[PDB]
Coordinates of C-alpha atoms and ligand atoms in Angstrom, one line a residue:
Chain A
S9 CA -22.0 -1.7 -8.2
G10 CA -20.6 1.7 -9.1
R11 CA -17.5 4.0 -9.5
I12 CA -16.5 7.3 -8.0
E13 CA -14.6 9.6 -10.3
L14 CA -12.6 12.6 -9.1
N15 CA -11.8 15.0 -11.9
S16 CA -9.5 18.0 -11.3
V17 CA -10.4 18.0 -7.6
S18 CA -8.7 20.5 -5.3
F19 CA -9.5 21.7 -1.8
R20 CA -8.8 24.7 0.5
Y21 CA -9.7 24.9 4.2
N22 CA -8.8 28.6 4.5
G23 CA -5.4 29.6 3.3
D24 CA -3.7 27.4 0.8
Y25 CA -4.8 24.2 -1.0
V26 CA -4.5 21.0 1.0
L27 CA -5.4 19.2 -2.2
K28 CA -4.2 20.4 -5.6
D29 CA -6.0 19.0 -8.7
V30 CA -6.6 15.4 -7.9
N31 CA -7.6 12.8 -10.5
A32 CA -8.8 9.3 -9.6
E33 CA -11.3 6.5 -10.1
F34 CA -12.5 4.3 -7.3
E35 CA -14.3 1.3 -8.6
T36 CA -16.4 -1.3 -6.6
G37 CA -14.8 -4.6 -5.9
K38 CA -11.1 -3.5 -5.6
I39 CA -9.4 -2.1 -2.5
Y40 CA -7.4 1.1 -2.3
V41 CA -4.9 1.9 0.4
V42 CA -3.9 5.5 0.9
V43 CA -0.6 6.6 2.4
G44 CA 1.4 9.8 2.9
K45 CA 3.0 11.8 5.7
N46 CA 1.1 13.9 8.2
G47 CA -0.4 16.9 6.5
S48 CA -0.4 15.4 3.0
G49 CA -4.2 15.4 2.5
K50 CA -5.4 11.8 3.1
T51 CA -8.3 12.6 5.4
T52 CA -9.4 15.5 3.2
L53 CA -9.4 13.3 0.1
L54 CA -11.4 10.7 2.0
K55 CA -14.0 13.2 3.3
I56 CA -14.4 14.6 -0.2
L57 CA -15.1 11.0 -1.3
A58 CA -17.8 10.4 1.4
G59 CA -19.4 13.7 0.7
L60 CA -18.4 15.2 4.0
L61 CA -16.5 18.1 2.4
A62 CA -17.4 20.1 -0.7
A63 CA -14.4 20.3 -3.1
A64 CA -13.5 22.3 -6.1
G65 CA -13.8 20.4 -9.4
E66 CA -16.0 17.6 -10.7
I67 CA -17.0 14.4 -8.8
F68 CA -19.0 11.7 -10.6
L69 CA -20.9 8.9 -8.9
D70 CA -21.7 6.5 -11.8
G71 CA -21.3 8.8 -14.8
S72 CA -23.6 11.4 -13.4
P73 CA -22.4 14.3 -11.2
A74 CA -22.6 14.0 -7.4
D75 CA -22.9 16.7 -4.8
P76 CA -21.8 15.8 -1.2
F77 CA -25.4 14.9 -0.2
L78 CA -25.5 12.2 -2.9
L79 CA -22.0 10.9 -2.0
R80 CA -22.8 10.6 1.7
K81 CA -25.9 8.6 0.6
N82 CA -23.5 6.0 -0.8
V83 CA -20.2 6.1 1.0
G84 CA -19.9 5.2 4.7
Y85 CA -17.1 7.0 6.5
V86 CA -15.1 6.1 9.5
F87 CA -13.3 8.9 11.4
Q88 CA -9.7 8.8 12.7
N89 CA -11.2 9.5 16.1
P90 CA -14.3 7.2 16.5
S91 CA -15.8 9.5 19.1
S92 CA -16.9 12.0 16.5
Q93 CA -19.4 9.5 15.1
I94 CA -20.5 7.9 18.4
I95 CA -23.9 9.0 19.7
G96 CA -26.6 7.2 21.8
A97 CA -27.2 6.2 25.4
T98 CA -26.3 2.6 24.5
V99 CA -24.4 0.8 21.8
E100 CA -27.5 -0.5 19.8
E101 CA -28.8 3.1 19.8
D102 CA -25.4 4.1 18.4
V103 CA -25.5 1.5 15.6
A104 CA -29.1 2.2 15.0
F105 CA -28.5 5.9 14.7
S106 CA -27.9 6.2 10.9
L107 CA -30.7 3.7 10.5
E108 CA -32.5 6.9 11.1
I109 CA -34.1 7.4 7.8
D113 CA -38.1 -1.4 10.2
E114 CA -37.6 -1.7 14.0
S115 CA -38.0 -5.4 13.1
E116 CA -34.8 -5.5 10.9
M117 CA -33.0 -2.6 12.4
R118 CA -32.0 -4.8 15.3
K119 CA -30.0 -7.7 13.9
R120 CA -28.4 -5.8 11.1
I121 CA -27.2 -4.2 14.3
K122 CA -26.0 -7.3 16.1
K123 CA -24.6 -8.6 12.8
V124 CA -22.3 -5.7 12.4
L125 CA -21.6 -6.1 16.2
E126 CA -20.6 -9.8 15.9
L127 CA -18.6 -8.8 12.8
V128 CA -16.5 -6.2 14.5
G129 CA -16.2 -8.3 17.6
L130 CA -18.5 -6.4 19.9
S131 CA -21.3 -8.8 20.7
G132 CA -22.6 -8.6 24.3
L133 CA -21.8 -5.0 24.9
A134 CA -24.7 -3.6 22.9
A135 CA -26.4 -2.6 26.1
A136 CA -23.4 -0.5 27.4
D137 CA -22.8 3.2 27.4
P138 CA -20.6 3.7 24.3
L139 CA -18.8 6.5 26.2
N140 CA -17.3 4.0 28.6
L141 CA -15.9 1.5 26.0
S142 CA -12.1 1.0 25.7
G143 CA -10.3 2.8 22.9
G144 CA -10.1 -0.2 20.7
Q145 CA -13.7 -1.1 21.4
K146 CA -14.8 2.5 20.5
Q147 CA -13.0 2.0 17.1
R148 CA -14.7 -1.3 16.7
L149 CA -18.0 0.5 17.4
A150 CA -17.4 3.1 14.7
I151 CA -16.6 0.3 12.1
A152 CA -19.8 -1.4 13.1
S153 CA -22.0 1.7 12.7
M154 CA -20.5 2.4 9.3
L155 CA -21.0 -1.2 8.2
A156 CA -24.7 -1.2 9.2
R157 CA -25.3 1.6 6.7
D158 CA -24.6 -1.0 4.0
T159 CA -23.0 1.4 1.6
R160 CA -21.5 0.6 -1.8
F161 CA -18.3 2.3 -0.7
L162 CA -16.4 2.0 2.6
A163 CA -14.1 5.0 3.3
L164 CA -12.0 4.2 6.4
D165 CA -9.6 6.7 8.0
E166 CA -7.2 4.6 10.0
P167 CA -10.0 2.3 11.4
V168 CA -7.9 -0.2 13.3
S169 CA -5.1 2.2 14.4
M170 CA -5.5 1.2 18.0
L171 CA -6.3 -2.6 17.9
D172 CA -3.4 -5.0 18.5
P173 CA -2.1 -6.6 15.3
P174 CA -4.1 -9.8 15.7
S175 CA -7.3 -7.7 15.9
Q176 CA -6.1 -5.5 13.1
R177 CA -5.5 -8.6 11.0
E178 CA -9.0 -10.0 11.7
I179 CA -10.8 -6.7 11.0
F180 CA -9.0 -6.4 7.7
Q181 CA -10.1 -9.9 6.8
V182 CA -13.7 -8.7 7.5
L183 CA -13.1 -5.8 5.1
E184 CA -11.5 -8.1 2.5
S185 CA -14.6 -10.3 2.7
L186 CA -16.7 -7.3 2.0
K187 CA -14.5 -6.5 -1.0
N188 CA -15.4 -9.9 -2.4
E189 CA -19.1 -9.1 -2.0
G190 CA -18.8 -6.1 -4.3
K191 CA -18.1 -3.2 -1.9
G192 CA -15.6 -0.5 -2.8
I193 CA -13.0 -0.1 -0.1
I194 CA -10.7 3.0 0.4
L195 CA -8.4 2.6 3.3
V196 CA -6.1 5.2 5.0
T197 CA -3.4 3.7 7.2
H198 CA 0.1 4.2 8.6
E199 CA 0.8 0.6 9.5
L200 CA 0.2 -1.5 6.3
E201 CA 1.6 -4.3 8.5
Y202 CA -1.7 -6.1 8.9
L203 CA -2.7 -5.7 5.3
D204 CA -3.3 -9.1 3.7
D205 CA -3.8 -8.0 0.1
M206 CA -4.6 -4.8 -1.8
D207 CA -5.6 -3.8 -5.4
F208 CA -3.9 -0.4 -5.2
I209 CA -1.7 1.8 -3.2
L210 CA -2.1 5.6 -3.6
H211 CA 0.6 7.8 -2.2
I212 CA -0.1 11.5 -1.5
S213 CA 2.8 13.9 -1.2
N214 CA 1.3 17.4 -0.8
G215 CA -2.1 17.4 -2.4
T216 CA -1.4 15.3 -5.4
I217 CA -1.4 11.5 -5.9
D218 CA 2.3 10.8 -6.5
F219 CA 2.1 7.1 -7.1
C220 CA -0.7 4.5 -7.8
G221 CA 0.1 0.9 -8.6
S222 CA 0.9 -2.6 -7.3
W223 CA 2.6 -3.1 -4.0
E224 CA 5.9 -4.2 -5.7
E225 CA 6.0 -0.8 -7.5
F226 CA 5.6 0.8 -4.2
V227 CA 8.4 -0.9 -2.3
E228 CA 10.5 -0.2 -5.4
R229 CA 10.0 3.5 -5.9
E230 CA 11.3 4.0 -2.3
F231 CA 9.3 6.4 -0.4
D232 CA 10.7 7.7 2.9
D233 CA 7.6 8.9 4.6
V234 CA 6.1 5.4 4.7
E235 CA 7.4 2.6 6.9
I236 CA 8.0 -0.6 4.9
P237 CA 6.7 -3.7 6.8
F238 CA 9.4 -5.9 8.3
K239 CA 7.4 -8.9 7.1
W240 CA 8.0 -8.0 3.4
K241 CA 11.6 -7.0 3.9
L242 CA 11.9 -10.5 5.4
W243 CA 10.0 -11.9 2.4
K244 CA 12.3 -10.7 -0.4
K245 CA 15.5 -11.8 1.4
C246 CA 15.5 -15.2 3.3
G247 CA 12.4 -16.1 1.3
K248 CA 10.1 -18.7 2.7
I249 CA 11.8 -19.6 6.0
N250 CA 8.5 -20.7 7.6
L251 CA 9.0 -18.3 10.5
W252 CA 5.3 -18.8 11.7
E253 CA 6.1 -22.2 13.1
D254 CA 7.7 -20.4 16.1
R255 CA 4.2 -19.2 17.0
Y256 CA 3.1 -22.7 17.8
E257 CA 6.3 -24.9 17.6
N258 CA 4.3 -28.1 17.9
Chain B
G2 CA 10.6 9.2 40.2
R3 CA 10.0 5.9 42.1
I4 CA 6.4 5.0 41.4
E5 CA 5.3 2.0 43.3
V6 CA 1.7 0.7 43.0
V7 CA 0.5 -1.5 45.8
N8 CA -2.4 -4.0 45.7
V9 CA -4.4 -1.6 43.5
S10 CA -7.7 -2.5 41.9
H11 CA -10.4 -0.1 40.6
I12 CA -14.1 -0.4 40.3
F13 CA -16.0 2.0 38.1
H14 CA -19.2 3.1 39.8
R15 CA -19.3 0.9 42.9
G16 CA -22.9 0.6 44.0
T17 CA -24.8 0.5 40.7
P18 CA -25.6 -2.6 38.6
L19 CA -22.4 -2.4 36.5
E20 CA -19.3 -2.0 38.8
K21 CA -16.8 -3.4 36.2
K22 CA -13.6 -4.8 37.5
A23 CA -11.3 -2.6 35.3
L24 CA -8.2 -3.5 37.4
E25 CA -7.6 -6.6 39.5
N26 CA -4.9 -6.3 42.3
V27 CA -2.1 -4.7 40.4
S28 CA 1.3 -4.3 42.0
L29 CA 4.6 -3.5 40.2
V30 CA 7.7 -1.4 40.8
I31 CA 9.1 1.1 38.3
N32 CA 12.4 2.6 39.2
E33 CA 13.8 5.9 38.0
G34 CA 15.4 6.2 34.5
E35 CA 13.4 3.1 33.6
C36 CA 11.0 2.8 30.6
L37 CA 8.1 0.5 31.1
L38 CA 5.7 -0.9 28.4
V39 CA 2.2 -1.6 29.6
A40 CA 0.8 -4.2 27.2
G41 CA -2.3 -6.4 26.9
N42 CA -5.6 -6.9 25.0
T43 CA -8.3 -4.3 24.8
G44 CA -10.0 -5.5 28.0
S45 CA -6.9 -5.6 30.1
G46 CA -7.3 -2.0 31.2
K47 CA -3.9 -0.5 30.8
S48 CA -5.3 3.0 30.2
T49 CA -7.2 2.8 33.5
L50 CA -3.9 1.9 35.2
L51 CA -1.9 4.7 33.7
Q52 CA -4.7 7.1 34.7
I53 CA -4.3 5.9 38.3
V54 CA -0.5 6.1 38.1
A55 CA -0.8 9.7 36.7
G56 CA -3.1 10.5 39.7
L57 CA -6.1 11.2 37.4
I58 CA -8.3 8.8 39.3
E59 CA -8.4 7.4 42.8
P60 CA -8.2 3.6 43.2
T61 CA -11.3 2.2 45.0
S62 CA -8.9 -0.2 46.7
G63 CA -5.3 0.8 46.5
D64 CA -2.4 3.2 46.8
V65 CA 0.3 4.4 44.4
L66 CA 3.2 5.6 46.5
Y67 CA 5.7 7.9 44.8
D68 CA 7.9 8.0 47.9
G69 CA 5.0 7.6 50.3
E70 CA 1.9 9.8 49.7
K73 CA -1.3 11.6 47.4
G74 CA -0.9 14.9 45.5
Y75 CA 0.9 18.2 46.1
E76 CA 3.0 20.0 43.6
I77 CA 4.2 16.6 42.5
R78 CA 1.9 17.3 39.6
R79 CA 4.9 19.2 38.4
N80 CA 6.6 16.0 37.3
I81 CA 3.7 14.1 35.9
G82 CA 2.8 14.3 32.2
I83 CA 0.3 11.9 30.8
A84 CA -0.7 11.8 27.1
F85 CA -4.2 10.4 26.3
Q86 CA -4.6 7.8 23.6
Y87 CA -7.1 10.2 22.0
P88 CA -5.5 13.6 21.9
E89 CA -8.9 15.5 21.6
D90 CA -9.8 14.0 25.0
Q91 CA -7.1 16.2 26.3
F92 CA -7.6 19.5 24.5
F93 CA -9.3 22.5 26.2
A94 CA -7.7 25.4 24.5
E95 CA -8.7 27.3 21.4
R96 CA -5.1 27.8 20.2
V97 CA -2.2 25.4 20.0
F98 CA 0.0 27.8 21.9
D99 CA -2.3 27.9 24.9
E100 CA -2.8 24.1 24.8
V101 CA 1.0 23.5 25.0
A102 CA 1.7 26.4 27.4
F103 CA -0.7 25.0 29.9
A104 CA 1.7 23.0 32.1
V105 CA 4.2 25.9 32.3
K106 CA 1.5 28.5 33.0
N107 CA 0.1 26.3 35.7
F108 CA 3.0 24.9 37.6
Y109 CA 5.4 27.8 36.9
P110 CA 3.2 31.0 36.8
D111 CA 6.2 33.3 37.2
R112 CA 8.2 32.4 34.0
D113 CA 7.6 33.3 30.4
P114 CA 6.4 30.2 28.6
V115 CA 7.1 31.2 24.9
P116 CA 10.7 29.8 24.8
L117 CA 9.7 26.5 26.5
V118 CA 6.6 25.8 24.4
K119 CA 8.7 26.8 21.3
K120 CA 11.3 24.1 21.9
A121 CA 8.6 21.7 22.9
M122 CA 6.7 22.3 19.7
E123 CA 9.8 21.9 17.5
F124 CA 10.9 18.6 19.1
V125 CA 7.6 17.1 17.9
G126 CA 8.1 18.6 14.5
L127 CA 5.6 21.4 14.8
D128 CA 6.9 24.7 13.4
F129 CA 6.2 27.5 15.9
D130 CA 5.3 30.3 13.5
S131 CA 2.9 28.0 11.6
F132 CA 1.0 26.2 14.4
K133 CA 1.0 28.5 17.4
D134 CA -2.2 30.3 16.4
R135 CA -4.1 27.4 14.8
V136 CA -7.0 25.7 16.5
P137 CA -6.0 22.3 17.9
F138 CA -9.3 20.6 16.8
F139 CA -8.7 21.8 13.2
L140 CA -5.4 19.9 12.8
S141 CA -4.6 16.5 11.2
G142 CA -4.6 13.4 13.4
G143 CA -0.8 13.3 13.4
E144 CA -0.6 17.0 14.2
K145 CA -3.0 16.5 17.1
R146 CA -0.8 13.7 18.4
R147 CA 2.2 16.0 18.2
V148 CA 0.4 18.8 20.0
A149 CA -0.5 16.4 22.8
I150 CA 3.0 15.1 23.1
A151 CA 4.4 18.6 23.1
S152 CA 2.0 19.8 25.8
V153 CA 3.0 17.0 28.1
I154 CA 6.8 17.3 27.6
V155 CA 6.9 21.1 27.6
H156 CA 7.7 21.4 31.4
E157 CA 10.0 18.3 31.5
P158 CA 8.2 16.1 34.1
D159 CA 10.0 13.3 35.9
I160 CA 7.2 10.9 35.0
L161 CA 6.2 10.8 31.3
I162 CA 3.2 8.6 30.8
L163 CA 2.4 8.0 27.2
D164 CA -0.9 6.2 26.1
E165 CA -0.7 5.1 22.5
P166 CA 1.8 7.9 21.5
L167 CA 2.8 6.4 18.1
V168 CA -0.8 6.2 16.8
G169 CA -1.3 8.7 13.9
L170 CA 2.3 9.7 13.3
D171 CA 4.3 9.2 10.1
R172 CA 7.9 7.8 10.2
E173 CA 9.3 11.3 11.0
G174 CA 6.8 11.7 13.8
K175 CA 7.6 8.3 15.3
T176 CA 11.4 8.9 15.2
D177 CA 10.7 12.2 16.9
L178 CA 8.8 10.5 19.7
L179 CA 11.4 7.8 20.2
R180 CA 14.0 10.5 20.3
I181 CA 11.9 12.1 23.1
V182 CA 11.9 8.8 25.1
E183 CA 15.6 8.4 24.7
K184 CA 16.3 12.0 25.7
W185 CA 14.3 11.3 28.8
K186 CA 16.1 8.1 29.7
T187 CA 19.4 10.0 29.3
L188 CA 18.1 12.5 31.9
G189 CA 17.4 9.5 34.1
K190 CA 13.6 10.1 33.9
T191 CA 10.8 7.7 34.0
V192 CA 8.6 6.8 31.0
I193 CA 5.5 4.6 31.0
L194 CA 4.2 3.3 27.6
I195 CA 1.0 1.8 26.3
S196 CA 1.4 0.5 22.7
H197 CA -0.2 -2.4 20.8
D198 CA 2.8 -1.9 18.5
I199 CA 5.4 -3.6 20.7
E200 CA 7.7 -4.2 17.7
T201 CA 8.7 -0.6 17.4
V202 CA 8.8 0.5 21.1
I203 CA 10.8 -2.5 22.3
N204 CA 14.2 -1.3 21.2
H205 CA 13.7 1.6 23.6
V206 CA 12.0 -0.2 26.5
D207 CA 13.6 -1.6 29.7
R208 CA 10.7 -3.5 31.3
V209 CA 7.4 -5.0 30.1
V210 CA 4.3 -5.5 32.1
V211 CA 1.2 -7.3 30.7
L212 CA -2.4 -7.0 31.9
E213 CA -5.4 -9.3 31.6
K214 CA -8.9 -8.4 32.7
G215 CA -7.2 -6.2 35.4
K216 CA -4.9 -9.0 36.5
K217 CA -1.1 -8.7 35.9
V218 CA -0.1 -11.8 34.0
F219 CA 3.5 -10.7 33.3
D220 CA 6.1 -8.5 34.9
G221 CA 9.5 -9.5 33.5
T222 CA 12.2 -7.5 31.7
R223 CA 12.4 -6.6 28.1
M224 CA 15.0 -9.4 27.5
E225 CA 12.8 -11.8 29.4
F226 CA 9.6 -11.0 27.6
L227 CA 10.7 -12.2 24.1
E228 CA 12.1 -15.3 25.7
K229 CA 9.5 -16.3 28.2
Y230 CA 6.1 -15.2 26.8
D231 CA 3.5 -16.9 24.6
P232 CA 4.7 -16.0 21.1
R233 CA 1.6 -17.0 19.3
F234 CA 0.9 -13.4 18.4
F235 CA 4.4 -12.0 17.8
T236 CA 5.1 -10.0 14.7
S237 CA 7.7 -11.4 12.3
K238 CA 10.3 -9.0 13.6
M239 CA 9.5 -10.1 17.2
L240 CA 9.8 -13.8 16.3
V241 CA 13.2 -13.0 14.6
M242 CA 14.5 -11.0 17.6
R243 CA 13.3 -14.0 19.6
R244 CA 15.4 -16.5 17.6
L245 CA 18.3 -14.1 18.3
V246 CA 17.7 -13.9 22.0
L247 CA 17.2 -17.7 22.4
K248 CA 20.6 -18.6 21.0
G249 CA 22.4 -15.9 23.0
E250 CA 22.6 -12.6 21.1
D251 CA 21.1 -9.2 21.7
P252 CA 18.8 -8.1 18.9
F253 CA 18.0 -4.8 20.5
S254 CA 21.0 -3.3 18.9
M255 CA 20.7 -4.3 15.3
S256 CA 19.3 -2.2 12.5
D257 CA 16.3 -3.5 10.6
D258 CA 18.8 -5.1 8.1
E259 CA 21.3 -6.5 10.6
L260 CA 18.5 -8.5 12.0
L261 CA 17.8 -10.1 8.6
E262 CA 21.5 -10.9 7.9
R263 CA 21.7 -12.6 11.3
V264 CA 18.7 -14.8 10.3
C265 CA 19.5 -16.0 6.9
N266 CA 23.2 -15.6 5.8
Ligands
ANP1 N1 -15.2 5.2 32.9 C1 -15.5 4.0 32.7 N2 -16.6 3.5 33.2 C2 -17.0 2.2 33.0 N3 -16.2 1.2 32.5 C3 -15.0 1.7 32.0 C4 -14.6 3.0 32.1 N4 -13.3 3.1 31.6 C5 -13.0 1.9 31.2 N5 -14.0 1.0 31.4 C6 -14.0 -0.4 31.1 O1 -12.8 -1.0 31.7 C7 -12.2 -1.9 30.8 C8 -10.8 -1.4 30.6 O2 -10.8 -0.1 29.9 P1 -9.4 0.5 29.4 O3 -8.6 0.9 30.6 O4 -9.7 1.7 28.5 O5 -8.7 -0.7 28.6 P2 -7.5 -0.5 27.6 O6 -6.4 -1.2 28.2 O7 -7.2 1.0 27.4 N6 -8.0 -1.2 26.1 P3 -7.4 -0.4 24.8 O8 -6.7 0.9 25.1 O9 -8.7 -0.1 23.8 O10 -6.5 -1.3 24.0 C9 -13.0 -1.9 29.5 O11 -13.8 -3.1 29.4 C10 -13.9 -0.7 29.6 O12 -15.2 -1.0 29.1
ANP2 N1 -10.6 20.5 10.0 C1 -9.5 21.1 9.5 N2 -9.6 22.5 9.4 C2 -8.5 23.1 8.9 N3 -7.4 22.6 8.4 C3 -7.4 21.3 8.5 C4 -8.3 20.5 9.0 N4 -8.0 19.1 9.0 C5 -6.8 19.2 8.5 N5 -6.3 20.5 8.2 C6 -5.0 20.8 7.6 O1 -5.0 20.3 6.3 C7 -3.7 19.7 6.0 C8 -4.0 18.3 5.6 O2 -4.8 17.6 6.5 P1 -5.2 16.1 6.4 O3 -6.0 15.9 5.2 O4 -5.9 15.6 7.8 O5 -3.8 15.4 6.3 P2 -3.6 13.9 6.7 O6 -3.1 13.1 5.6 O7 -4.9 13.3 7.2 N6 -2.4 13.9 8.0 P3 -2.5 12.7 9.1 O8 -4.1 12.4 9.4 O9 -1.9 13.3 10.5 O10 -1.8 11.5 8.7 C9 -2.9 19.9 7.2 O11 -1.9 20.9 7.1 C10 -3.9 20.2 8.3 O12 -3.3 21.2 9.2
CL3 CL1 -7.2 5.6 -9.3
CL4 CL1 11.6 1.4 6.3
CL5 CL1 -6.7 26.5 12.2
MG6 MG1 -5.7 12.0 8.5
MG7 MG1 -5.7 2.1 26.3

């Protein structure tokens, strides 16, 4: 178990702050969805969480302080563009890569994450020549293999079709039940089954953080509200899904 | 303007123990002023196809005839946007990245005005992004830079591979505005998008791939009414109920749809 704690955290790339005094706690077992317009600071926040960026302020991993090198050691990260974490002549070499630091085990933890993301049978293929969706699947796999307490995903299924998006999220949800912290940045929210929290980022600060209901209520304009939920509150249970099969 | 693909199929690395049948005898017609959505699973190979149509690769067993032909300055009117924008970058500054097409196909004319309007119609402020490094932008900003760089010289064929991916609401309405303002000009658009639900208000004809095979080539109206709806989104199923009884859901705001479903 565990709990990341951002206290008075702010970040600059070079110019002005892209994060301005952020305060949050991310606790194992719950799932956090992060939303906000382009250039709000979602990815920067996430990289500061996975120890990929050193930020100003205090960050605690389980009471004690944490430098980036400790944070990395305990949060797996998935890039918006999977290609920047893909390396290896073949797929198993790719998954194997951050099992860098045994050969026995380090081969079906592999094909476990591969069957999990739906990539079984391509483990002997040049990662470079996978399809876009399959490259994303790959990145998810390699991060999952790490077996970190926290999973920081930066729009992981942004190029899978909604059935695939839905299934991947179900995998994540399962992993939430097994006591893994999950922080998820997305622009769709459509495929999201359930969530413990939604954070909204405006311009470096966390504007909102609560239930989904509270979110659809406050009315944000930068974030697309799922047609499914709009259709839930009016009409109610119309049992639309029958149309998918209609006997 | 009149791209016709004839019995095309493509084999990656024909000779070696892999070959891979990316495409499997594809043939479809896409008239001018028509917006086409290329759909399918992740193995279907729609990106491969759009690469061929854009003249980026050579089919190992086919021809794409524009009005005959090949490649000359027909380049001029092709603009393809990669599903991963970084796969398309080459420049160290956003300005150069966008100004490419103009500087290449139109070496005589000053590009600064053109790339300026291009940048602002994807929401990128000129004196704010022109001197930044493309690789040091957000995902959405990268997407915008790509879009801009392929619409800057107003091609007749605008091929967009996953253009919505990474954009906020404002970014997506900017993109759809672009698509419209190129149908108004009677220009051709070619779309890849797993998110059919959004694109479909602005699409004239759907094509669906399957392991290289074309397993559908109907119209927009004929896709929601004649295609396996097992994996439709709720909005799509709703629009489907509205097309089956007679009406035209492609002209109803996200609320008008609801009212016409339960009330
Ligand atoms: N350069 C390549 N060399 C070898 N195989 C390739 C290459 N490009 C694509 N493929 C394969 O061809 C198939 C189709 O690829 P692709 O055209 O990217 O599909 P896609 O429609 O874009 N899927 P996606 O965009 O992820 O939803 C996949 O099984 C790839 O593994
Ligand atoms: N690597 C980088 N170097 C310098 N500036 C950057 C970098 N990445 C992002 N920025 C800038 O920092 C701001 C916030 O970036 P970012 O944290 O990626 O926002 P975001 O929420 O991820 N936007 P998006 O991914 O498109 O939905 C933007 O104005 C970017 O231009
Ligand atoms: Cl919190
Ligand atoms: Cl909305
Ligand atoms: Cl920069
Ligand atoms: Mg981002
Ligand atoms: Mg593709």
